[PDB]
Amino acid sequence: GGMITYGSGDLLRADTEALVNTVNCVGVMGKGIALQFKRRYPEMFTAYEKACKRGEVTIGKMFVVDTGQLDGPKHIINFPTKKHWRAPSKLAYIDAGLIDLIRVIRELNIASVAVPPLGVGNGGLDWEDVEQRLVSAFQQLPDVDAVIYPPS
Ligand SMILES: [Cl-]
């Protein structure tokens, strides 16, 4: 059925139905993988920025956008790993987000997703901690292919 695999190279070139991006709640995708997502999906960013100004993006809730692309990823799942970008990430934010990430994958019937190392580096979390949680979460989706990208 579904496999959890070790990703490498550029997450944005993953051959999956969804891509996960790591975001803050204040409307700024200024460095790291979020910057790359902004450059590739400018309409997605504009929607995210509007939602942030209105207070609609919060810890524990995915902000999901459709790409509308005939080829490649259909959904961008923006996973909040931080409140303000000034502040670090926390394991509790990852726990809460994963709950909604699973819910969203089920609800949208996503067959495959690529996931970055949520809150590691930029957010200051330990990889091994986050990797455990990611693997645990995707074991609840036995028919989904999950490609997990370690710190690069
Ligand atoms: Cl499943």
UniProtKB/TrEMBL annotation:
Highest taxon, organism lineage: Bacteria
Residues in Macro domain copies: 3-152
GO annotation, biological process: peptidyl-glutamate ADP-deribosylation
Signal sequence, renumbered to the chain: none
Name of the molecule in the record: Macro domain-containing protein
Whole sequence portion shown: 1 to 150 of 352
